[model samples]
Target: MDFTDKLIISRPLYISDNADPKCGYCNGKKDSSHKFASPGWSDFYKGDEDKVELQSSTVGFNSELVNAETYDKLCNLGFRRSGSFMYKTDMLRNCCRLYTIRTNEKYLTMSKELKTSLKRFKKKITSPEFKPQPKYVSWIDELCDYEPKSTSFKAVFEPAEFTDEKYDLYVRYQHYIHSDEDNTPSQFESFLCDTPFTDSEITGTEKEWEQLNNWHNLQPGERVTKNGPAHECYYHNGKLIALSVLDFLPSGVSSVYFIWDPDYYDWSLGKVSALRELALVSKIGRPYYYLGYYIDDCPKMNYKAKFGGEILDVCNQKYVPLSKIHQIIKHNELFVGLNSTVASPDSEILITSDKINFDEPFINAVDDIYGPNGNASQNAITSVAKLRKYGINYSPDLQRSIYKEIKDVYRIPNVVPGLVPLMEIVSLFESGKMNELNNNVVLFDTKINALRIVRDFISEKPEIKTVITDVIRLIGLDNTKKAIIII
Candidate 1:
């Protein structure tokens, strides 16, 4: 098979879940209460109160050898990368809906507060002896690359690598700003130092600045793509005061996280850092600066709205202006696509089965098997017999089928676009597209030291199909076809 122009770098995909019911924004306190029901599962639809619970759940995967172009696509679908991991919030079910917020040079007109903060910061950067002259106050030049020749502040843009200085700043920032002192060098390293970008290359200062100037000039259809993670370290007279962890992608710049010294808190470094990052995007000619997740109710997160940008509508896979959906989001309602006017369909087998009665007694009995009294395998056997008499279905195989079917029925496909449902994946397997022995697709069996056709490697291990299905669902069929998964 011809392998011209194919992405040679491929990595195994593993699905992971780090979901919990505990709300971090409100800290699960009822005083900050908001209804916790999704779509048709709400009391307004089904009157089923038990389906509602505070949600702070997230699901993601660890990344390896991921290209910035693909990562940019994932970002468009509401996924954000934290170091080496990629994750997207379950917006419909999550109590605090974290919308991916993006802004551009065209969108950032500078709010009154932003203007005030920028003015103060610009003064601080300039030498005290320098007389105040007639100011054009071009913030893009002031906060970004084109600074006053009299300025003492210097920003070193480089790849995100761990240094004692940066770690010290991180530790101090965490201690003073967050009041949590349990940070270690390793934790800080993994949190900000790790990256999964494959084509990431750091250029020298002269060429980099020249590229920035050229990009700012806006040549027709000509642009340079700076791919991968970087640290925009802000130094004032050679002292590290703040560090901005950023991912420079093919499409735009993504703000992973920011750290600033609390000693300069009165200077409003938080405000300055955001403005500087936005200005940097403008200077670099990238269209979007992703401001990470915008949780509306959270004071820290909602401030991003003032910058004026669009929020990602996951259901529709489109970015809607904050102005258009401000009220809807304020009420904390589940916002679906405007064209699709429908609710989740009720599960016929799981919801309306008259033969099964999952009442309090039956639930208590099932709990008892796992409770301190312990399963005592006989208890499960006894419950199974009782369930069997009532025509209740059993078996892990049966449950898996029903669970997969029910998830699609509940509109999970719309909630997470681009993911092929498991049933379709199973159909591909049954059709011999996945497990045929002679197919040209190459797979690396990490267990063994050689490569083989997809089927030869997977024929004996049926369980590996589950992982392949998830990988296909997440990265899409095209990526799956091109990628070499390690079995």
Candidate 2:
């Protein structure tokens, strides 16, 4: 069978035909068709040429055999086999799993970097009363001891039934809100009430809450529904400040949804919460943690990358270390694991390799343009090269000639915002030397100068009439100017 121009192969299940005459299990079944079974078949068969049909197979046999066959086919399709599974080198699954392996291995080392991070964590823990004692002491023992009452914090684990008080706290701590528009909070509240609003007026609502709850409740291989376990947590001075709602799946792994007080954000309570959950599950000796999904492009989901453990990639159908994903993404590769196809009469199609090396010219151009100390000249050269490589087919001289023309068409400006001066002003404040009003005014003037330079550059382009409007909106000039005028 060909699947998307790739060959698909299947293999027969392993079975034994010859058995001892006195063995009750085999029933002295020599020469019986039960030599090698098609996964789910009750009866096995002999003869390598005979196709083992699966109609009467046990479910376990069927599943295992099917998986084995699929893996065999993948191995033939340039997929690398590790143990019993085959994986694609470029697939997200392979990349993520590889990253996991790397992270875990790196964590095993007592490197200077790890030591520094631990030292910082300990300092923070010792700074205040009611601070919780850090968990995972063995992993980070160089930083601090498990001080039970050293005016510090300790992670508290309490398993309790969800109650009304917990529910109210959950509602209050739910921070999913629109920060960009006015009345977003009210709109969110109204939605929670199930009150209908016009599309434009619609902010977040009860539907969103239900959807979030449903998302939280969904389990692997289970249909999604609204009702789910209500797990909650609370943090207080000298009291437990974090909570989790966890569901144990049939696969013997725990899935969790959590909320914590806003005050705990700096402590990375969310990460601590996840780590605690993993430790609990590991103590119970479960092999896997289904961290939902880790989408690299989404900033919100990127945090999952920090958790060190065995990561499974669906694409590769194998486990990998997580620290090596960047190399895979940078190369733009795809890793495939299990794939299926229906049998067809046409000539079988096979793809021997899905790995396509990035074009040398493109990579060189990127390196030249975005490398350290790069500027307009390098950018222009790289841009022209990119255009030609992408099939624009412009001659070298013509490409150079068009740089100005293209710049005019795009209305490119010369002076970009310089944030360094603003950062310096912040540094001055931090150093406690910005008390002089004139010094502050000078900092404000430096920012205005940079803005004016940008404005003048844009003004040279007659086609760009709204340069001021664009710049003003980009920097929230209204808010900045309001503060400056008051000062």
Candidate 3:
């Protein structure tokens, strides 16, 4: 089918703790998600803090039930869906760092620059003896049939109730992959399987799905979807090595997650799955591929920097070529990892000479409040450093000065007045006002920001972080004030 011929009609599913009930989980049902900062999801928060786990924070609105046109615009701004809902990151805040990355589907043959990066690697891979090549085989099919290997390793979708085969692998990978021992099937099913939104039109693609389902030696817990997430399986000598979760949207594909049996870790299966997905993207005539987050400091995520495409510079609200990657990564200019000890430079200098129009939503929001101090308000969201980038130029002293004045203004207790600079990060984290951020953010408002500040205070209290480390005890764990601090 042609790319445009593909239509994904999603509803405006908004299930906040108080959004409409039709929003599915948006109304904050038991199956629904919890605080954005809590540990249920996010690459920023999953890893050990000592391991440099910092990334960025995003505003989530899933099943908020949006139609294609609206959602398409959201995608352009770098908003993304997690399971049943969608999320947009906050680029203004210095603490949370994120980059929305993509792969250009139309430019398939490889650009001159990227081709070199690939050429250098393909040269190494082509060597006559590249560790036996892992004996490969793959197929895009249903999550059944293969369970017959009894040891064939089943692909559990909407994972519910894990049996021995999959659960063992899950724990093994978790223990090896993540330093946390608390991994469980119940948690796995809840985090990876459950969903509140539907595709509204995936049947045509799945015409072949039921056939795979009907023939499976059929594991009792097989999760099937009529209009749901896609699963691609990989087998090495039929051992069921890797599983990739994906979402097929209008004109593109969003890679949800990729997990593998680490015994095959040396196989570089992650790179293989990604390249294959890009191939499928080109084959399907789609023009884009969403690769989730790109953090400047995290080694695991920095790879996306080299993928060759535009990155949504959230503060600028535009997608610029990835040339900014090196600047952002090395100086930690545009991005900041959680492990950062020092502050970012006061400003970023755009490497490209292109005079592109900068995004105005954030500054506009600051200005609209009091009426167009606007030009000045444009500088309100800390100016396009994103502040963390390079342009937001208020130094630590200047920033610290504003911080004190703003705190003093809000200090007059019980008044509950809003921000001073009128910027989103003036409150550190803001909600609502997404319309101003080009819909790529679901920031907090004064009402929520106040509480979120307190919540974060309890989390980041000079007292809290240092509160326990000297007191808590664990082997190989340092008492150096970095315990469990998963950004």
- The top-ranked prediction according to TM-score is 1
Per-candidate RMSD, Å: 10.8, 28.4, 17.6
What's each prediction's TM-score?
0.72, 0.32, 0.47
State the lDDT of candidate 2 residue by residue for 31-135, as single tens digits. 222222111111212233233221111000111111222322222222322212222221211112112121222233344544454455456666554445455
For model 2, what is the alpha-carbon lDDT of residue 242? 58
Model 2 misplaced stretches (Cα beyond 4 Å)? 1-137, 140-161, 176-234, 238-240, 249-255, 324-326, 330-334, 337-487
lDDT of 1 at 128: 59
The residue-by-residue lDDT of candidate 3 on 1-487, one tens digit each, is 1222222222122111122232221222221122122121222333422322222233333342333443444565556656445554433322324567777544334446544443443342343433332332322121121223333223332322234555566677778776367667666654444533333433334444653334333233432322235556665555767777666566476787777888776556676567656755554455788888665555677676555666665433456556544453342333212112322322221211122343321111211221112132334434323323312223232221110111221011110011122233322223322112221112123333321211232233333322121111110111111112211
Ranking by TM-score: 1, 3, 2
- Which 10 consecutive residues of model 3 have the lowest summed lDDT? 410-419
lDDT of 3: 0.39
Best by lDDT: 1
